[PDB]
Design a protein around this motif. Structure first.
Motif, PDB file in Angstrom:
ATOM      1  N   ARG A 275       1.290   3.748  -3.154  1.00  0.00           N
ATOM      2  CA  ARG A 275       0.940   5.479  -2.106  1.00  0.00           C
ATOM      3  C   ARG A 275       1.205   6.214  -3.335  1.00  0.00           C
ATOM      4  O   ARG A 275       0.935   7.771  -3.302  1.00  0.00           O
ATOM      5  CB  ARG A 275       0.378   5.018  -0.553  1.00  0.00           C
ATOM      6  CG  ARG A 275      -0.717   6.853  -0.363  1.00  0.00           C
ATOM      7  CD  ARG A 275      -1.071   6.543   0.902  1.00  0.00           C
ATOM      8  NE  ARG A 275       0.213   6.340   1.788  1.00  0.00           N
ATOM      9  CZ  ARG A 275       0.677   6.267   3.092  1.00  0.00           C
ATOM     10  NH1 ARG A 275      -0.411   4.748   2.497  1.00  0.00           N
ATOM     11  NH2 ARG A 275       1.079   5.745   3.582  1.00  0.00           N
TER      12      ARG A 275
ATOM     13  N   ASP B 131       0.645  -1.379   0.376  1.00  0.00           N
ATOM     14  CA  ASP B 131       0.284   0.488  -0.318  1.00  0.00           C
ATOM     15  C   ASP B 131       1.120   0.988   0.037  1.00  0.00           C
ATOM     16  O   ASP B 131       0.645   2.267  -0.688  1.00  0.00           O
ATOM     17  CB  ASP B 131      -1.188  -0.108   1.125  1.00  0.00           C
ATOM     18  CG  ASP B 131      -2.129  -1.061   1.333  1.00  0.00           C
ATOM     19  OD1 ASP B 131      -2.264  -0.904   0.017  1.00  0.00           O
ATOM     20  OD2 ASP B 131      -2.914  -0.923   2.287  1.00  0.00           O
ATOM     21  N   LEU B 132       1.878   1.125   0.956  1.00  0.00           N
ATOM     22  CA  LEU B 132       3.019   2.513   0.809  1.00  0.00           C
ATOM     23  C   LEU B 132       3.280   2.410  -0.568  1.00  0.00           C
ATOM     24  O   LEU B 132       3.630   3.740  -0.789  1.00  0.00           O
ATOM     25  CB  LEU B 132       3.917   2.536   1.761  1.00  0.00           C
ATOM     26  CG  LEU B 132       4.949   3.012   2.536  1.00  0.00           C
ATOM     27  CD1 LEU B 132       4.123   4.718   2.379  1.00  0.00           C
ATOM     28  CD2 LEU B 132       5.742   3.242   3.610  1.00  0.00           C
TER      29      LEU B 132
ATOM     30  N   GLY C 228       7.898   7.435   5.272  1.00  0.00           N
ATOM     31  CA  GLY C 228       7.073   6.213   5.014  1.00  0.00           C
ATOM     32  C   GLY C 228       6.745   4.972   6.099  1.00  0.00           C
ATOM     33  O   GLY C 228       6.491   4.673   6.861  1.00  0.00           O
TER      34      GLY C 228
END
Ligand SMILES: Nc1ncnc2c1ncn2[C@@H]1O[C@H](COP(=O)(O)OP(=O)(O)O)[C@@H](O)[C@H]1O
Ligand SMILES: Nc1ncnc2c1ncn2[C@@H]1O[C@H](COP(=O)(O)OP(=O)(O)O)[C@@H](O)[C@H]1O
Ligand SMILES: Nc1ncnc2c1ncn2[C@@H]1O[C@H](COP(=O)(O)OP(=O)(O)O)[C@@H](O)[C@H]1O
Lengths: 106, 102, 104
Positions: free
Chosen positions: C27, C23-24, C78
């Protein structure tokens, strides 16, 4: 003692397992003295998903071919792989590395 | 914004039978961690190494180590690869947490 | 055949947190990634023995992500809170590629 190190390149070639023979044929034809294959990969590309199997190595797998090669071979190999990745899914990563035995790779 | 620090990373490709010898050497030299990749096939100068379909005949050990360790490690591995199959790749890498690796 | 500079991340972590990691990457605008499964290893506190791994959550994976240099900083930021609390490592490599547009 001094343990001398020498410059080499390392290719990481990610592509569908169905094209393994085309790839290793090309590597052999170019004079690559060895290679290593990592199987059962997962991955996400611009268009599709590759789910690595949780039990076995299936035929429609994603694989990565690792090949350490002398500098002089990189150019010709990429030209050889150019029509392939122009036609098929996958990527090539070129690394700078050092090795202890230049003769093992030529 | 996020500072990076220099490190070396070894990829050590060899037969699974010698896993313990390899990891003993890394441990003795004071390596703080390593990663072992199984389920490999490969072609060497003399033979083919066929991976299992399901145990690990060929393996790759990834070990991120401070520069000062590369010499001693290669000395340790020299007599081994003198007698046995496999290769060692030395990389330059960067990491965010220097004390995690020494 | 022209070659161009890029970075490649090797992200080693427990399989249980794979979705957090991917997901990171997604994104942040990373254009692809490859995951190496069924890994064992030795860490700062314990041994991750492959024969002792039975669930996909308990297994280690390595996520390979080739990314433009400008994306590295924000990505590591992140991942920074994650690795403060969780196991694993990130290796940043210099690499070269042929199709720079494929990675942006
Ligand atoms: N930037 C990247 N970093 C790491 N691996 C990648 C990257 N891009 C692609 N790959 C690997 O190559 C595979 C093929 O993706 P791609 O070349 O975009 O083909 P497709 O267009 O069919 O998705 C991906 O599933 C992934 O495993
Ligand atoms: N140039 C190379 N690039 C990547 N992997 C290699 C290379 N040469 C050897 N290897 C890996 O190391 C293994 C052992 O090679 P080698 O020591 O030449 O074995 P042999 O006893 O068959 O000559 C190979 O099967 C391959 O997986
Ligand atoms: N120096 C290193 N080189 C290669 N891989 C490493 C290194 N340190 C850690 N790793 C990988 O990350 C995993 C987790 O390490 P770590 O975060 O120290 O675990 P823990 O602290 O939970 O015991 C290890 O099992 C290994 O696979």
């Amino acid at each position: 003692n001094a343990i001398k190190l020498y410059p080499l390149k390392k290719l990481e070639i990610i592509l569908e397992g169905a094209h393994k023979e085309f790839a290793t044929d090309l590597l052999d034809r170019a004079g690559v003295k060895g290679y290593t294959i990592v199987g059962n990969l997962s991955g996400k590309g611009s268009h599709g998903m590759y789910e690595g199997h949780l039990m076995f190595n299936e035929d429609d797998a994603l694989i990565m071919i690792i090949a350490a090669v002398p500098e002089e071979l990189v150019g010709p190999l990429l030209e050889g792989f150019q029509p392939f990745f122009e036609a098929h899914s996958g990527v090539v990563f070129v690394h700078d590395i050092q090795v202890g035995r230049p003769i093992k790779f030529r």
